[PDB]
């Protein structure tokens, strides 16, 4: 069911991944979030980046309207973009998420990653060679902005996202902290396994969220092809065989058993409703060694663009 975080509210240990790439019509937002409460999610994570928080609002709005659920059986994540760390910034940015979902408040407002770019509307501001602009800004005074938009009401929650471990230390060493980010929600996987970010994750009591857990969407912009595609790795698929699940459910089984909450995104009906079957079945500790046999170290978003900059979380 759900975690307690650090400033007690509860998380659904499942969530929906809702961005599609912009081949895929704005409308089916819409469509595959009413589908995912109807299979049985709970959790709900969108972002200012995937231009889709009226779609997925409305589905939420659609199913409150339709007596499905209540607004305080959803948990909703938005995330501040990174043209909008400056603290000035913050809450105009999470005042606009609300506008578009048409919600009083999210569940839980991230800081999407930790790499600031220029301040602006243009999503990855560009130069003349076409060098995306990098920003320099003190992530400690957006999360202080972070702060006065949970005393206001407008995030049940805060957290961050794309944080390492020194990223997180900055935050909870901050001279007058208020409140500890709750999560840090990170590329996480059988060949990302984040372990060392996990153990130091569990000692903060701030809880890491997987995200690319059935190993991305292999977006081209970002995803080298050689890459081995997870859902195809053989340990995985002898797990799916041994249990009768897929190599999704064990990829998913794999990080509730470690205490992380897993996303998975789908726009496909079938794949909605399988993904919720990962309650239904338990790996062994044997299993768990197999799957932590797997990590080598590769994170799928992998891009020129991403490691040159300064703030780039990892090394
Ligand atoms: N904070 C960040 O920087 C960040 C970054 C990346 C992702 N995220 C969040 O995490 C979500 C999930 O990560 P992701 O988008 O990278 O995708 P993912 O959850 O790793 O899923 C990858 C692919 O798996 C497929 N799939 C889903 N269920 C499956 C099943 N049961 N069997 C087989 N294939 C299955 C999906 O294709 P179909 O749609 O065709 O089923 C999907 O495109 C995102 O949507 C977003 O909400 C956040
Ligand atoms: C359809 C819109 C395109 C989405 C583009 N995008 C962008 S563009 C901004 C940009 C471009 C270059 C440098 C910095 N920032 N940055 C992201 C950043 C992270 C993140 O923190 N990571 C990734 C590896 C290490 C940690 C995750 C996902 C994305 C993403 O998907």
């Known amino acids: 069911q759900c975690?307690?975080?650090?400033?007690?509210?509860?998380?659904?240990?499942?969530?929906?991944?809702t961005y599609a790439?912009?081949?895929?019509?704005?409308?089916?937002?819409?469509?595959?979030?009413?589908?995912?409460?109807?299979?049985?999610?709970?959790?709900?994570?969108?972002?200012?980046?995937?231009?889709?928080?009226?779609?997925v609002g409305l589905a939420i709005r659609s199913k409150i309207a339709d007596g499905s659920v209540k607004r305080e059986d959803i948990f909703y994540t938005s995330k501040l973009w990174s043209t909008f760390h400056r603290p000035?910034?913050?809450?105009?940015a999470?005042?606009?998420?609300?506008?578009?979902?048409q919600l009083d408040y999210v569940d839980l407002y991230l800081i999407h990653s930790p790499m600031s770019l220029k301040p602006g509307e243009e999503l990855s501001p560009t130069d003349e060679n076409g060098k995306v602009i990098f920003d320099i800004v003190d992530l400690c005074t957006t999360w202080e902005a972070m702060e006065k938009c949970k005393d206001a009401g407008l995030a049940k929650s805060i957290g961050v996202s794309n944080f390492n471990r020194r990223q997180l230390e900055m935050?909870?060493?901050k001279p007058g902290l208020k409140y500890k980010p709750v999560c840090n929600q990170v590329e996480?996987?059988?060949?990302?396994?984040?372990?060392?970010?996990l153990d130091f994750c569990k000692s903060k009591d701030i809880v890491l969220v997987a995200y690319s857990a059935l190993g991305s969407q292999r977006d081209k912009r970002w995803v080298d092809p050689n890459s081995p595609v997870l859902l195809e790795?053989?340990?995985?698929?002898?797990?799916?065989?041994?249990?009768?699940?897929?190599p999704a459910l064990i990829a998913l089984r794999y990080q509730l058993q470690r205490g992380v909450v897993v996303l998975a995104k789908s726009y496909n009906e079938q794949r909605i409703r399988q993904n919720v079957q990962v309650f239904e079945f338990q790996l062994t500790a044997e299993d768990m060694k197999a799957i932590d046999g797997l990590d080598r170290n590769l994170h799928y978003f992998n891009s020129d663009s991403f490691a040159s900059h300064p703030n780039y979380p990892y090394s």
């Open 171 to 173: 935050i909870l060493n």
């Open 233 to 246: 790795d053989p340990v995985l698929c002898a797990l799916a065989k041994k249990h009768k699940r897929t």
């Open 94 to 101: 999470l005042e606009n998420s609300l506008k578009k979902a």
């Open 21 to 55: 790439p912009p081949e895929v019509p704005r409308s089916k937002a819409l469509e595959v979030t009413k589908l995912a409460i109807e299979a049985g999610f709970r959790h709900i994570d969108s972002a200012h980046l995937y231009n889709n928080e009226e779609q």
């Open 188 to 197: 996480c996987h059988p060949y990302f396994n984040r372990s060392k970010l």
């Open 3 to 17: 975690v307690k975080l650090n400033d007690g509210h509860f998380m659904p240990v499942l969530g929906f991944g």
């Open 88 to 92: 000035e910034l913050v809450r105009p």
